[PDB]
Design a protein around this ligand. Structure first.
Ligand code: QXI
Ligand code: QXI
Ligand code: CL
Lengths: 302, 298
């Protein structure tokens, strides 16, 4: 029993965190095998960030300009290449702590753990979700760039996010590990803003099923809804449209609890209308949207 | 910017998690140097009588795909200490510390000696933890990290009927009036950790949310009279002193933040949120707020 926002154990990722310095700029790098991955803006100064020509800035650098520090050991850079917004620094030592890993690009609504790092040293771990507007509501200060987001599937680390910037609303933007930004963001200090964010409907429903599994049914009702009527109501509260894929994905939780997905949708519609009336659901007075159907099944069952 | 419920990096603890099996019971053990620590109920009660009937070879300890050989066993309060022939080469710098209610720690939830998740939680004033544990989670540990030293403060033993959890320090002393047996046990009436709510209000101010601030102040006694009415823990001069740094950084005296908290208790949030929460959050200590809002690393 109990339902917590649970991060993956960070050990496999901690053994990959390194410090990358280029000139006056210091950030974090991810050392996997003989390559250190880091944001390409490590080659920029603050002035360069308005309209940086990364190809032009990078061609002026040599291997020895990049100082890579793994613990108290300086790694030697023997090559460098840029792939989208990520710099790949070839080093002369393969990381003996390299876990079984893969690079995965996630979709909005997906969750992941973030190992926040400063100067190549892990400081904390928390759970995040890729917002529908492609930002993450992280906890990141200056020096956190290069910190990564991941999931662990059996013994395999799936790296899905690398931190690049904080937008003016305090939310965060980054790339997958191939350097492709999530959303319409660029690694420039040009005027950029997160789009209007919305609630991840499929995740709220997953969390309502988690509440039912843990013994809370106060919010259920005798009603059902069509998917279209649910979406018409949902959109009015800035909730993401629920697709047939989402309904299919919620099938297992629907079967375990005996509550049809559209029956849970009617409950959600009523919660949006009435609020909680001084009550809580899994210790929360707000509808929680950073647990996926997969996270609920993992935490409530195994 | 941002404020998350943040756990310590769990790597130093992950390298200590082992599986302990005795008969039909499988749970988790903490392998530090040549000793594996686990709940004494793995032998299940008259624990001295149950333990004397066991031999070393009855305890199957598995560290990854390697079976460790138990060469001795002893009980300390509600923890079983299994002496093994191999010292854990991954043993971090560590200490066993007993925490006070209101103090927070990270929990590395484990099943079959394998870490599955990490989350942050607080020792409630009623000595329970609002954890997330399933069957097989016994032996999972709570910890804090200071510099490079892991301070182990909790070992999971049981779930109470309300779904909250009970355990011991690493010396096997239970937190709370709990006992390790299948019997009628219930968590006492819980209270809110006042110093932690104030720490979280300071974190909200640091993060740019000031809507709840007011021009008013209060006395410590008047604040405590109001706080007692709302099942909040009394705020002591120690708590006020501990909040000194956050008070200086934001320019809001601790009793000035107390007046804001008094108004939040008597009037609610009025459709508003604080750090994305419609409830007053009490599982961040003043130190957790400073650490997260300064980027301390390990
Ligand atoms: C590494 C950092 C640097 N360090 N010394 C020189 N430079 C120059 C390059 N740097 C940046 O510009 C990083 C920066 C950024 O967003 N950094 C931050 C990230 N996360 C959380 C933060 C919290 C507080 C302050 C800054 C934060 C600063 C703002 O503007 C942008 C715009 C586009 C991009 Cl891709 C990145 C950035
Ligand atoms: C390890 C477990 C065992 N497994 N197979 C044989 N045994 C015998 C010993 N075991 C217990 O009795 C453990 C138990 C307990 O509380 N276990 C649990 C812990 N955390 C979360 C849980 C979620 C769902 C169900 C059980 C959970 C079960 C209930 O009653 C008590 C009462 C006193 C004590 Cl100290 C422990 C327990
Ligand atoms: Cl995905």
């Amino acid at each position: 029993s109990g339902f917590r926002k649970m991060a993956f154990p960070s050990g496999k990722v901690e053994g990959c965190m390194v410090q990358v310095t280029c000139g006056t700029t210091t950030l974090n790098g991810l050392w996997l095998d003989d390559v250190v991955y880091c944001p390409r803006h490590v080659i920029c100064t603050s002035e360069d960030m308005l309209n940086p020509n990364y190809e032009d800035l990078l061609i002026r650098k040599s291997n020895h300009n990049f100082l890579v520090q793994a613990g108290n050991v300086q790694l030697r850079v023997i090559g460098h290449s840029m792939q989208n917004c990520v710099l790949k620094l070839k080093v002369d030592t393969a990381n003996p702590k390299t876990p079984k890993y893969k690079f995965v690009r996630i979709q909005p609504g997906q969750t992941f753990s973030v190992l926040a790092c400063y100067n190549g040293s892990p400081s904390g771990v928390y759970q995040c979700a890729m917002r529908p507007n492609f930002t993450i509501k992280g906890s990141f200060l200056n020096g956190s760039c290069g910190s990564v987001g991941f999931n662990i599937d059996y013994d395999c680390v799936s790296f899905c996010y690398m931190h690049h910037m904080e937008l003016p609303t305090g939310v965060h933007a980054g790339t997958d590990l191939e350097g492709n930004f999530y959303g319409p963001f660029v690694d420039r200090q040009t005027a950029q803003a997160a789009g209007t964010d919305t609630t991840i409907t499929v995740n709220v429903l997953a969390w309502l099923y988690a509440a039912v599994i843990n013994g809370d049914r106060w919010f259920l009702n005798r009603f059902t809804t069509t998917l279209n009527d649910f979406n018409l109501v949902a959109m009015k509260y800035n909730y993401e449209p629920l697709t047939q894929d989402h309904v299919d994905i919620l099938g297992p939780l629907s079967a375990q609890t005996g509550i049809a997905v559209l029956d849970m949708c009617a409950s959600l519609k009523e919660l949006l209308q009435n609020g909680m009336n001084g009550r809580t659901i899994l210790g929360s007075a707000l509808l929680e949207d950073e647990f996926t159907p997969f996270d609920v099944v993992r935490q409530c069952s195994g």
